[PDB]
């Protein structure tokens, strides 16, 4: 309306195939934690599963990839980055039915984004994830989330590459 002036989300315009790709993988990231019940974190992608896992890997900290975002995600650096791709605060655009309507919907992706990583605190400010965090469907959906959240980053800042390394996924040959 007349006084208001909504609050505009940073966005990559074009689908290109960088972008796809990350997509795409981390879709079957998500595939493979969630159907498969394995991890892609490590070498053959085993399973997370109590009775199936690797004897020795049950926590984040045990799991290098998982060990290296857990410090990314405390790094002010990183989480810059974050508040750079989910934007400021949304403000609502029209004093409307259809204005909150959009409102509504530009909160809930904003809290998405800005939750998109592991280094997020609980209702205490203490860290949801850290080294001793149990490997698991919620968890590792949650690190699946980051993997794709820091790929995003570099596409939008290729520079950050050197910041934020490539970490080694592994697919099933199923999936
Ligand atoms: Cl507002």
Redesign the pocket.
């Known amino acids: 309306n007349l006084y208001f002036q909504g609050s505009a989300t940073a966005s990559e315009l074009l689908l290109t195939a960088a972008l796809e790709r990350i997509e795409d993988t981390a879709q079957a990231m998500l595939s493979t934690v969630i159907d498969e019940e394995r991890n892609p974190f490590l070498e053959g992608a085993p399973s997370y599963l109590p009775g199936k896992r690797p004897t020795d890997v049950t926590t984040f900290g045990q799991v290098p990839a998982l060990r290296d975002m857990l410090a990314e995600s405390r790094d002010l650096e990183f989480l810059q980055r974050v508040s750079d791709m989910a934007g400021p605060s949304?403000?609502?655009e029209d004093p409307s039915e259809e204005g909150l309507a959009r409102?509504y919907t530009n909160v809930s992706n904003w809290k998405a984004q800005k939750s998109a990583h592991l280094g997020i605190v609980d209702h205490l400010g203490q860290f949801v994830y850290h080294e001793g965090s149990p490997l698991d469907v919620a968890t590792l959906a949650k690190a699946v989330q980051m993997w794709k959240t820091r790929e995003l980053i570099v596409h939008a800042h290729p520079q950050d590459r050197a910041r934020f390394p490539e970490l080694a996924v592994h697919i099933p040959e199923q999936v």
Do not use: G, S
Request: aromatic fraction near 0%.
């Open positions: 949304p403000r609502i409102h």
